[PDB]
Design a protein around this nucleic acid. Sequence first.
RNA 1: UAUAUAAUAGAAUAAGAUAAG
Length: 30
Amino acid sequence: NPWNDGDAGWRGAATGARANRGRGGFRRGR
RNA sequence: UAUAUAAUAGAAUAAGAUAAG
């Protein structure tokens, strides 16, 4: 899709919904 | 889409000299 123009947006944002769909343990830490 | 859990037992029965206050 060209209209996205390299912008993931909400699907690739930092929102709590996207940060609550992984199980890594947050051990190493960003 | 993750690297991890830990429980079964039993027996009846005694040796004995220190150069002291």
